[PDB]
Amino acid sequence: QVQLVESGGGVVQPGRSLRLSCAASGFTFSSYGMHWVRQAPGKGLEWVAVIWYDGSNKYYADSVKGRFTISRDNSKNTLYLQMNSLRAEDTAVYYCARALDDASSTSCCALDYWGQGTLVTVSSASTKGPSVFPLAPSSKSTSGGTAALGCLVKDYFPEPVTVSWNSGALTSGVHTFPAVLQSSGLYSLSSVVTVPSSSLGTQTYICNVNHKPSNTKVDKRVEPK
Amino acid sequence: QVQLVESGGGVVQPGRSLRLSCAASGFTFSSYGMHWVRQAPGKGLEWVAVIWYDGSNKYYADSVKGRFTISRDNSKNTLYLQMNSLRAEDTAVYYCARALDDASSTSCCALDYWGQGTLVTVSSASTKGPSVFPLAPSGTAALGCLVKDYFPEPVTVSWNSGALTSGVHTFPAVLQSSGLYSLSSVVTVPSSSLGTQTYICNVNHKPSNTKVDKRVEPK
Amino acid sequence: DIQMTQSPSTLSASVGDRVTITCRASQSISSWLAWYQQKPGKAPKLLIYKASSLESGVPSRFSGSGSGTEFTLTISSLQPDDFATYYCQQYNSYFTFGPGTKVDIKRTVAAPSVFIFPPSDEQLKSGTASVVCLLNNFYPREAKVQWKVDNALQSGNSQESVTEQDSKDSTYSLSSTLTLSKADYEKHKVYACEVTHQGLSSPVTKSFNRGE
Amino acid sequence: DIQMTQSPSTLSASVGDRVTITCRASQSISSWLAWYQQKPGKAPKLLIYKASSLESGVPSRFSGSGSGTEFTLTISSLQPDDFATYYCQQYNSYFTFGPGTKVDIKRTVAAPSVFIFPPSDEQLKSGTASVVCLLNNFYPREAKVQWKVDNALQSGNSQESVTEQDSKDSTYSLSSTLTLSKADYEKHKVYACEVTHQGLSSPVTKSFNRG
């Protein structure tokens, strides 16, 4: 039915430009006003812009006025957001959303259908592969107890990295933490897993770290100490 | 701060044209509807015209239809009122006023910011000095000076070159039927002083170079 | 059009009074009613909109109420800068204002001292005759002046001017000027000014006969 | 601008509970108030519009009330798929959202299992040293970690990360990473992670000696 498919997000430096797209289907796109809404990492929702069904009237949030331009192509059933002079503070997932049609209402709008979002990252940082270090478990006997091990994925940019254990064979007890943005502009994360201490002598544990932007593919064996 | 600075008012004869301006600052002028409201001397407020934020729709009061035109130049943040075929009844202080943005309301408008006003005087009169007549006294006595038939405003009146201030009432000028202004200035004094104290009203009408000291004697 | 009226015309109040002024509409305006303040020589100032919503920056002692054809502006504790004139304005159908209600400073009742001045001989030479009636140092503002020329009540033939309460005056003074041609002034004998004011137990008439 | 606030920020409930959350506007927004549901990594979903109108397709257990400044969202009987963050949004003057209320899964208190990791020899060869402390499978979410280096409290040199609530046991895990230069790491001996949590009657300290 109703579909809003977004594209155009990416990683850029401040001052660069980006153009987001929202391809609609399953309804009469030309009859609906449309909105852009963004969500910064770990934050709430912030309205960005609105455009009338016929493209006539447009309104913007104060934070983007004079930098962002909303437009639409009704023949292509596509909504656009032209983002010039990007700032680090524009880093967010950007959603397109349809204005709800409420005939009895004299104010607008609620947003009844949302796109899947497209990620815009703005930073002065440059692409960098992570350093992958073992978080070695203790081989001390704990009887029928538990040991913890992991991998430190240190100092990379940009998001994301993917971490698996034993090429995806190991899933139980795994916790891959959200990345933390450091003051240098780089990210680090760790992925840990709890295992029976009695398994440490025999079962090999290996973390597989992939960071596509830097062509990084590392398999790090995590041996007990 | 929001500011609305008006200009363009002045003295014109009936049937002439005059253009008012209202320069805005401190807010987003192109997103607000604007009004003109006028106030005749000594009277109340009277709505004149309204124009939409984008200059699309315009509405006028019946008393100015066909004669006044409201317009705006959003690039210059300026509101205009073009006043043609001016009548003496158009004499008033004219205000520009911003339409209040009450999001919940379905009717409009209240007016939340007003300009300082500009005075439009439509008169066939020309510059003319006043005549100064005594208001002779007959215990408290009243006396004064009638300052009649001058144009334009203002005249100033003092008594005894500023030595007499107590009990002086200088009334605001009234526009007469002929289009000329007239006022009086009076003072109350002890009756016993009428035979020893001289009373002189000092009148100055700078637009006509009319400066007169009139002695007021009992009759 | 929708006609707006207000009562009273002048309201006597002291600092600290709870003051109410009323506004009426000739037909229902729902709640589309605003209140403005205005001081002499200054621009109006929005106080209340939608009958009861306080404009931002306006002191909370101001409040409005009413609907349909009856509306009230309330000042809970009048302050010195509230002595002013107040206008209501409807915006249900076009835009019309009430005549305004002035709030002035209350003091004891003071009856006017009434004086009448015949035209000067100097003005009679110029061809016109101005008869001046003076109501001096009275309070409250309300006062009726009636002109009579040989017992004929004048209507629309005179103009009034008033001096207001200020830093030196607690009372009003008022002039009423009856202007006639010299020819008409010489046609009549008895010129009378009749003054009604709540400080007088009866109306006071001051008159003269032309020619002393 | 019209500011929207929400209360509480977080709420722990069980399946079947009656859940009522609040939303407030700094000025009057009449009934122009919408409620949204959002789950991690997913787009928001409209639940209520015009303060109380149920959006088509939304289960009948959702309701809303209010007009003016005070607004409530009520879930009559909390369902397993209702654990998410709920936002309110006014559309009387421009478009502003509340901070959001997160509804978590109520469970019993579980103390964290604490593990400490010295920096690897590989990292030390590279010139840096990261010490990692792990607080595993605890509840509720509030926990405090303090780094001690030869019994000296640390500041400005650590970073924490917390997982979402686990699917299987409804617990949280937390990592804290202390980052020093290799030179500074070599200057001290005892490295300790001190942990406090509701499930711990006394603070737990895990430590190791360098070398």
Partner: peptide
Amino acid sequence: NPNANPNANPNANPNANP
């Protein structure tokens, strides 16, 4: 309607139908 909203209204109806 002279009493219609003369200001820019971002909260007006942006759809083709009411």
